[PDB]
Amino acid sequence: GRRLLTFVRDIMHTGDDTPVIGLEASVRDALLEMTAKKLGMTAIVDGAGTIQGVFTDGDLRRLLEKAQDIHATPITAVMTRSCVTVEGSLLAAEAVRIMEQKRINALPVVENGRLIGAINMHDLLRAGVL
Amino acid sequence: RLLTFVRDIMHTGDDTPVIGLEASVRDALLEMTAKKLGMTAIVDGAGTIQGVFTDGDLRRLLEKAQDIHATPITAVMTRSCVTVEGSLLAAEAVRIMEQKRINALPVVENGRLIGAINMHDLLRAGVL
Ligand SMILES: Nc1ccn([C@@H]2O[C@H](COP(=O)(O)O[C@@]3(C(=O)O)C[C@@H](O)[C@@H](O)[C@@H]([C@H](O)CO)O3)[C@@H](O)[C@H]2O)c(=O)n1
Ligand SMILES: Nc1ccn([C@@H]2O[C@H](COP(=O)(O)O[C@@]3(C(=O)O)C[C@@H](O)[C@@H](O)[C@@H]([C@H](O)CO)O3)[C@@H](O)[C@H]2O)c(=O)n1
């Protein structure tokens, strides 16, 4: 039988492994954070830790189609504000459906708007999860 | 209806993201965007795969370069790229992507590019 139920909070990246920058960050800051946390994206939060947006590798491509010399560009000018988030109590099986339906690759995990971690497609494809 | 193998589910023909060896990074961006897979393949004139370039590659490039539009794709592409044959079971393409921590696969026959597939294609086809 199915051994145990897997929720997003069980396999999300948390603490210092969460990719996160503030509203004052630049695109350069975003790149460095994206690279460091290995999820292909970063969240952006306000001073209270509330999620304000995300910026993905795909977002970078789209930016580079319209701008050059982007290292000092404020993250707020280029991020996705109406981003998709999930609660930690979501089933992993539910999350994978959301990635498919919304055509995205990673999810910030939140509680009351407050960022608590992140997952991506590869977390959901781990052995035994689905 | 038939969705067993990679060849069944891949983007193929003109839906494949592909540019030639002579292309620039600007050409790569346009193609990456147009075909919606977050990557492009690079082929020689004969249609043989020479490399790939992904959205993650672009991040890594932007960490060490600026003003990249005119840069030749050969200078930044991944040459030793992972490829699959069309005869791969679709479930096995998922397993490769997971184990290798990659997000799309060019499909080949003896190095000749025939298509490309990513995780979203597999999800949409009911593979998982
Ligand atoms: N939790 C999330 C994750 C992503 N997004 C937004 O959704 C859009 C699509 O996300 P993406 O990660 O950029 O999606 C891409 C894309 O560029 O569209 C990336 C690309 O590498 C490739 O993986 C393709 C897939 O082939 C699916 O289209 O998908 C982006 O504007 C992003 O900021 C969001 O609102 N909330
Ligand atoms: N068929 C392929 C596909 C990709 N690659 C190469 O594999 C490397 C990783 O591919 P990526 O798509 O850039 O992979 C990323 C990356 O940035 O490394 C993207 C990011 O969304 C995220 O999915 C992370 C994983 O989360 C890391 O575990 O993976 C790249 O240099 C790419 O050229 C390859 O050789 N052959």
Side-chain angles (χ1 to χ4, degrees), chain A residues 38-41 57 105 120 122, chain B residues 38-39 52-57 59-60 77-78 80-83 100-106:
Chain A
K38 305 172 186 171
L39 299 187
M41 50 89 80
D57 290 343
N105 299 293
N120 80 357
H122 292 279
Chain B
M39 51 91 80
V52 300
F53 186 72
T54 71
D55 283 346
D57 295 324
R59 163 167 43 77
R60 287 178 285 278
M77 75 188 181
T78 297
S80 302
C81 64
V82 177
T83 68
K100 293 197 194 294
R101 290 304 199 93
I102 57 177
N103 302 292
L105 290 165

Side-chain angles (χ1 to χ4, degrees), chain A residues 69-83:
Chain A
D69 303 294
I70 58 171
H71 66 278
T73 299
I75 198 62
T76 47
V78 303
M79 73 186 183
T80 299
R81 273 188 196 269
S82 291
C83 66

Side-chain angles (χ1 to χ4, degrees), chain A residues 102 104-124:
Chain A
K102 288 283 166 32
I104 56 177
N105 299 293
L107 290 168
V109 192
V110 298
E111 176 174 338
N112 286 135
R114 173 177 63 81
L115 182 73
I116 68 171
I119 50 161
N120 80 357
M121 175 69 80
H122 292 279
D123 296 320
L124 300 171

Side-chain angles (χ1 to χ4, degrees), chain A residues 28 31-32 34-35 57-58 60-61 64-65 69-71 99-100 104-105 121-122 125, chain B residues 29 32-33 55-56 58-59 62-63 66-69 97-98 101-103 119-120 123-124 128:
Chain A
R28 189 61 179 94
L31 302 179
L32 281 168
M34 286 156 96
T35 290
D57 290 343
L60 176 66
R61 162 168 41 77
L64 286 159
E65 292 187 81
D69 303 294
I70 58 171
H71 66 278
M99 287 191 198
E100 194 248 21
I104 56 177
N105 299 293
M121 175 69 80
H122 292 279
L125 301 172
Chain B
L29 304 179
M32 286 158 98
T33 294
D55 283 346
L58 178 66
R59 163 167 43 77
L62 264 283
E63 294 190 277
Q66 183 165 326
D67 301 294
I68 59 172
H69 287 237
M97 284 190 262
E98 192 273 342
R101 290 304 199 93
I102 57 177
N103 302 292
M119 281 290 319
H120 289 277
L123 297 171
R124 284 169 202 177
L128 70 172

Side-chain angles (χ1 to χ4, degrees), chain B residues 1-25 27-128:
Chain B
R1 284 268 69 245
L2 286 179
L3 294 172
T4 311
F5 302 101
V6 153
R7 70 165 87 72
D8 301 325
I9 298 168
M10 73 185 174
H11 297 282
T12 196
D14 269 331
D15 288 4
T16 307
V18 58
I19 61 182
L21 275 176
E22 71 288 355
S24 64
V25 170
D27 296 332
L29 304 179
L30 185 71
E31 181 76 352
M32 286 158 98
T33 294
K35 312 299 179 57
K36 302 174 187 177
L37 301 186
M39 51 91 80
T40 185
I42 299 84
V43 293
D44 68 15
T48 300
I49 190 139
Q50 308 290 130
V52 300
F53 186 72
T54 71
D55 283 346
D57 295 324
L58 178 66
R59 163 167 43 77
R60 287 178 285 278
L61 174 62
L62 264 283
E63 294 190 277
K64 58 182 180 164
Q66 183 165 326
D67 301 294
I68 59 172
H69 287 237
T71 299
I73 197 64
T74 48
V76 300
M77 75 188 181
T78 297
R79 299 186 197 248
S80 302
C81 64
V82 177
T83 68
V84 296
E85 300 263 328
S87 55
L88 189 65
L89 291 162
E92 288 295 317
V94 170
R95 194 208 297 286
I96 288 166
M97 284 190 262
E98 192 273 342
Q99 288 185 2
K100 293 197 194 294
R101 290 304 199 93
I102 57 177
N103 302 292
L105 290 165
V107 194
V108 301
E109 178 193 79
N110 279 322
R112 175 178 63 84
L113 185 75
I114 68 169
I117 187 165
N118 80 358
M119 281 290 319
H120 289 277
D121 299 319
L122 293 163
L123 297 171
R124 284 169 202 177
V127 170
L128 70 172

Side-chain angles (χ1 to χ4, degrees), chain A residues 9-67 69-88:
Chain A
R9 65 177 177 279
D10 299 336
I11 54 172
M12 73 181 174
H13 301 287
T14 65
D16 286 311
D17 284 5
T18 314
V20 61
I21 62 181
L23 284 174
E24 75 297 340
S26 67
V27 169
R28 189 61 179 94
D29 294 331
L31 302 179
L32 281 168
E33 181 74 356
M34 286 156 96
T35 290
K37 312 303 178 60
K38 305 172 186 171
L39 299 187
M41 50 89 80
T42 186
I44 300 85
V45 292
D46 65 20
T50 299
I51 189 139
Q52 304 298 322
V54 300
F55 184 72
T56 70
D57 290 343
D59 295 324
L60 176 66
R61 162 168 41 77
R62 287 177 284 274
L63 177 58
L64 286 159
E65 292 187 81
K66 56 178 55 177
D69 303 294
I70 58 171
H71 66 278
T73 299
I75 198 62
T76 47
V78 303
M79 73 186 183
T80 299
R81 273 188 196 269
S82 291
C83 66
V84 181
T85 66
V86 297
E87 307 281 311

